[PDB]
Design a protein around this ligand. Structure first.
Ligand code: ZN
Ligand code: ZN
Length: 128
RNA sequence: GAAUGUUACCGCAAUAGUAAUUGAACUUAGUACGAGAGGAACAGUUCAUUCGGAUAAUUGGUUUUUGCGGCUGUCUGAUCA
């Protein structure tokens, strides 16, 4: 396949490129990975039995040269980020959670939404 | 409405009643929250629902202004009236 590029919606600015987006094997589904576990106040009690969704509603990327000044200035645990040419939020940063939309705990990495975010091929269109 | 000197004007306020009501839209903001889907609020600005008090510039209704005009039948000889 050919290379792609992911950009923002309501604003025309290029956010990131291809050679990213690890698939990371979304389903396992034994008893607890496909279930959105909400532990209660005591006794490791699990009330909410929510099946995980089928679609992958997040993009998983690498740290970026546009992400370097935000990571360098006033570093905290979890926050939010946006576009420099706009003010529409694209997600947040974390190194201890913010699992997926499918919901597995992964290595510390930056996520990207696909709500108010779209993707386009870097080459020309197919011209139907 | 009698009576309080007569009459006239301007007032006080004891007591009694009392009335306003609810919903939207924009902005706040697709922001907060939320992994995402979704998804607010205070303040501000417009209008609306039910109720109430008044008013008649305009619009509508009403017409014994019998005000002006028209029409039928008949009577005043015709015309006019
Ligand atoms: Zn933007
Ligand atoms: Zn996934």
């Amino acid at each position: 396949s050919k290379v792609t590029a992911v950009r923002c919606k309501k604003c025309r600015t290029k956010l990131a490129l291809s050679t990213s987006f690890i698939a990371h094997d979304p389903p396992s589904k034994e008893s607890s990975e496909g279930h959105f576990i909400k532990r209660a106040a005591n006794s490791h009690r699990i009330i909410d039995i929510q099946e995980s969704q089928a679609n992958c509603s997040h993009f998983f990327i690498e740290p970026l040269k546009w992400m370097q000044p935000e990571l360098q200035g006033k570093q905290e645990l979890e926050g939010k980020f946006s576009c420099p040419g706009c003010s529409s939020k694209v997600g947040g940063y974390n190194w201890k959670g913010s699992r997926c939309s499918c919901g597995k705990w992964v290595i510390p990495a930056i996520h990207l939404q696909t709500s108010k975010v779209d993707q386009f091929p870097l080459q020309s269109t197919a011209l139907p």
